[PDB]
């Protein structure tokens, strides 16, 4: 009944580490005392329900706050000038000066200027009044209420799902593909065609009249006759103004491509057609697997048969079905890797192809969103690899994977790790050397000696996609090619203009700075992969510790014997690779932010000139753009960016405090706590007040965790401020 009820070992633990480790292993349900697989799965299911309810509550809170305290209605009239308000500020610590400064956005109270793009998203989606946002918040609140009740219900005795149902892979994948992806995307396309395109074209479609108003003048007669080109006929004109009927068409499903000229975002007809088609594909693919009707596929059979001839990949994929369906960590790793790749994809695609009206001219929101999603992508990738390592050290069965495609990975892990080391070494050596060459050459007053490699291959991709300033004249750039001619009446007439228009972030012009920074990004990705892959492959054992699987995933060490065994557990591989995830995402975000600040400000010949050397990054990006942030508050007064300056210094302080736990280790602090225990016990008066848990220094893995925590939170706070405040102060 003591705090770690799930772990009787921590229950008998008498020191203060009991509380730390109980909180830390609260959610490590697999290793809890007296745990069975069925109970584990049911608990995971209920926790998923609660988590979904949290997500929808967060969404409803954002919606309600913008409805109640935000200037959504005023912003709708003038999207490009009025600054969106996130929520009102309630702070008794604010002075009169801060009150006047934070009173902004055309309201009489202090407020926070939204940098999440929710205003643009909802305006594009079809929200026009605070009432719609409030009703959305109410409905999401009801949804979360139902999800919480469902989570409670699915732990009851008569309503507790079984392990066979949990492990029913075919039905789950069929339903997720067909309905969760497919029918939900179909629902979104229907929403667009019924509510968003009419609202963009100046029609108020809501629940009271969406049943009466026809999305298309012809109705479903074209859909049933098969003359679906009537839904593309009469597209929106280039003189269309978003939210008004002037210049508005009647088409509901088009493939115009490019961007809407006024809003510089893709056409809602194009997006509706996208979601409709993509759903067709997914609803088809959700009929792949066999579920209670004979017709379909058997995933175990597929994996078993996929073994190439003559044992090229050993025994092929035999046993992989069993390992994946038995081990939740492998499923978690696959999910995290896929979702991290998808997060990187959305980060790369939203800025290049904006979808929300007037987002492109909102420079702060774009940078905030890109940085946000790139960081989360990095975290998801690190988690995918960490859970792969946990699977290897906890759930991997060599008897099942005898001569398997997965076992051969462990078989030639030495080759894999050595070659990842080679490529990381080459990339870092050469990228750093070229950067230093450029640094010294510009330093010595002779920039002509800079070694500047043109990214010819990326430029060739841009030319093949439609760029023409490079003059390569290949594929779509060459109007005559089969690629350019076959698609010349669907999307190219708009895409060509969009890509060759220099006012867009679609396929930005690139140069030697882009070459060098891309090779740096390659170095970051390769080294992070090296650390993570090595951790995963050596989690089971090593020449320095062949029996590591007995110790498990996260243990402090093996002692000073055999030369020392620091950070050998393959959890410390994750903890090391987290630094590199932060490093490479920071490089990515610095590249994005500087190139986009230059492009938005209209001087791309600052990035093209200065980015070739590192002092250009240190001066024309960091030092130059740090002035509006650090000048948030000074001796003469304060501005509305004082919060960003304070949070900038805050992230610096946390990043610095992490170095304490990372550098100084447990013995010093343990002995110091012995001294403090002596003092407290020996002083009078205070010694009547006595602890219950014996105070001890933080454990080794605990302190590694705390130091990495302080590092990461620090990273994100510092760049968030610098990316949100410098953009605001420069535009």
């Amino acid at each position: 009944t003591k705090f770690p009820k799930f772990s009787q070992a921590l229950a008998q633990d008498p020191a203060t580490r009991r509380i730390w480790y109980g909180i830390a292993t609260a959610h490590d349900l697999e290793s809890h005392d007296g745990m069975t697989e069925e109970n584990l799965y049911q608990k995971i299911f209920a926790s998923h329900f609660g988590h979904l309810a949290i997500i929808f509550l967060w969404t409803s809170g954002n919606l309600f706050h913008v409805a109640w305290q935000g200037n959504f209605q005023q912003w709708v009239l003038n999207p490009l000038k009025v600054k969106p308000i996130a929520h009102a500020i309630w702070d008794p610590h604010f002075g009169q000066s801060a009150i006047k400064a934070f009173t902004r956005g055309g309201v009489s109270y202090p407020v926070n200027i939204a940098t999440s793009g929710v205003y643009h998203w909802w305006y594009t989606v079809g929200m026009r009044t605070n009432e719609d946002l409030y009703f959305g918040a109410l409905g999401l609140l009801v949804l979360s209420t139902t999800l919480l009740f469902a989570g409670w219900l699915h732990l009851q005795p008569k309503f507790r799902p079984g392990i066979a149902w949990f492990k029913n892979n075919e039905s789950r994948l069929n339903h997720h593909l067909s309905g969760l992806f497919g029918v939900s995307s179909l629902a979104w396309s229907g929403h667009l065609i019924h509510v968003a395109i009419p609202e963009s074209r100046g029609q108020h479609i809501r629940w009271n009249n969406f049943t009466s108003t026809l999305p298309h003048p012809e109705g479903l007669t074209p859909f049933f006759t098969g003359n679906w080109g009537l839904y593309a006929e009469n597209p929106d004109t280039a003189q269309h103004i978003f939210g008004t009927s002037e210049g508005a068409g009647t088409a509901i499903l088009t493939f115009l491509g490019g961007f809407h000229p006024q809003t510089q975002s893709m056409w809602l007809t194009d997006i509706a057609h996208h979601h409709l088609a993509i759903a067709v594909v997914f609803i088809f693919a959700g009929h792949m697997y066999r579920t209670n009707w004979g017709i379909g596929h058997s995933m175990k059979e597929i994996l078993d048969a996929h073994v190439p001839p003559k044992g090229r990949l050993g025994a092929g994929h035999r046993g992989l079905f069993e390992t994946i369906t038995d081990s939740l960590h492998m499923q978690l790793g696959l999910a995290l890797a896929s979702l991290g790749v998808a997060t990187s994809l959305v980060a790369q695609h939203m800025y290049a192809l904006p979808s929300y009206a007037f987002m492109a001219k909102d420079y702060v929101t774009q940078a905030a969103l890109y940085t946000h999603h790139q960081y989360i992508a990095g975290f998801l990738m690190v988690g995918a690899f960490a859970h792969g390592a946990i699977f290897f050290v906890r759930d991997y069965d060599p008897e099942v994977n005898k001569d398997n495609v997965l076992a051969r990975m462990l078989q030639h892990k030495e080759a894999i790790i050595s070659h990842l080391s080679w490529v990381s070494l080459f990339l870092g050596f050469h990228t750093l050397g070229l950067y230093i060459h450029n640094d010294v050459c510009v330093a010595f007053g002779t920039p002509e000696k800079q070694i500047l490699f043109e990214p010819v291959f990326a430029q060739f991709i841009q030319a093949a996609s439609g760029k023409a300033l490079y003059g390569f004249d290949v594929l779509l750039s060459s109007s005559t090619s089969a690629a350019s001619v076959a698609s010349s009446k669907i999307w190219l007439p708009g895409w060509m203009e969009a890509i060759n228009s220099g006012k867009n972030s679609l396929f930005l012009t690139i140069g030697p700075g882009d070459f060098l920074v891309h090779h740096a990004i390659a170095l970051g990705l390769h080294t992070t992969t090296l650390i993570l892959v090595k951790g995963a492959l050596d989690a089971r054992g090593s020449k320095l510790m062949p029996d590591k699987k007995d110790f498990g995933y996260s243990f402090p060490c093996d002692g000073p014997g055999r030369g020392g065994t620091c950070d050998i557990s393959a959890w410390d591989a994750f903890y090391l690779a987290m630094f590199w995830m932060l490093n490479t995402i920071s490089w990515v975000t610095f590249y994005w932010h500087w190139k986009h600040l230059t492009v938005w400000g209209g001087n791309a010949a600052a990035f093209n000139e200065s980015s070739t050397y590192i002092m250009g990054w240190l001066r024309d990006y960091l030092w130059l753009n740090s002035s509006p942030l650090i000048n948030g508050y000074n001796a003469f007064g304060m501005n509305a960016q004082a919060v960003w300056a304070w949070m900038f210094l805050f992230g610096h302080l946390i990043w610095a405090t992490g170095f304490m736990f990372l550098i100084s280790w447990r013995g010093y602090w343990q002995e110091l706590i012995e001294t403090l225990v002596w003092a407290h016990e020996r002083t009078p008066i205070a010694n009547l007040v006595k602890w219950r848990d014996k105070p001890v220094a933080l454990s080794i893995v605990q302190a590694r965790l705390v130091g990495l925590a302080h590092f990461t939170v620090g990273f994100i706070f510092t760049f968030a401020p610098f990316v949100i405040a410098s953009t605001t102060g420069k535009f």
């Binding site: 209920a46 309810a53 309600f64 109640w68 409030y134 109410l138 609140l141 209420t145 409670w152 732990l155």
Partner: peptide, 30 residues
């Protein structure tokens, strides 16, 4: 303009959700 009654109704639904959250936390704790 969101009204006082609207805010109070949303707050009531939020309180119902809170009660359900305590219940779900209990049932996950057992």
């Amino acid at each position: 303009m969101i009204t006082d009654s609207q805010i109070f109704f949303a707050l009531c639904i939020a309180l119902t959700a809170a009660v359900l959250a305590i219940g779900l936390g209990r049932q996950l704790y057992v």
